[PDB]
């Protein structure tokens, strides 16, 4: 169930997984999925030639980046409080 290429699809599948994990308040795993997804979407952006597609992917990338930031700020804060 893995092949090379298809960056957009891989990225979207991972963020879909992150959002479910996020919804379930499983933030450590959620964050991992968000950043895996974001790495692929960045590749998707790099090789997207349709300007409208690029704008839309980029807009979503920003939204996910924003969510991922929130989760990391939460996770590391939590780890510090655990000490």
């Amino acid at each position: 169930h893995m092949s090379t290429g298809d960056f957009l699809t891989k990225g979207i599948e991972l963020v879909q997984k992150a959002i479910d994990l996020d919804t379930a308040t499983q933030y450590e795993e959620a964050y991992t999925a968000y950043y895996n997804g974001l790495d692929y979407l960045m590749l998707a952006l790099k090789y997207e030639k349709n300007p409208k597609s690029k704008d839309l992917i980029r807009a979503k990338f920003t939204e996910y980046l924003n969510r991922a930031e929130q989760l990391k700020k939460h996770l590391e804060s939590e780890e510090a409080n655990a000490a």
Partner: peptide, 26 residues
């Protein structure tokens, strides 16, 4: 049709806008 596929995938990308804000403090 690769073009229509690509366009559809982008169109249907998921949203985070339903997720609850996650505050950080002390």
């Amino acid at each position: 049709n690769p073009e229509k596929m690509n366009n559809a995938k982008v169109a249907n990308m998921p949203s985070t806008e339903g997720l609850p804000s996650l505050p950080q403090g002390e």
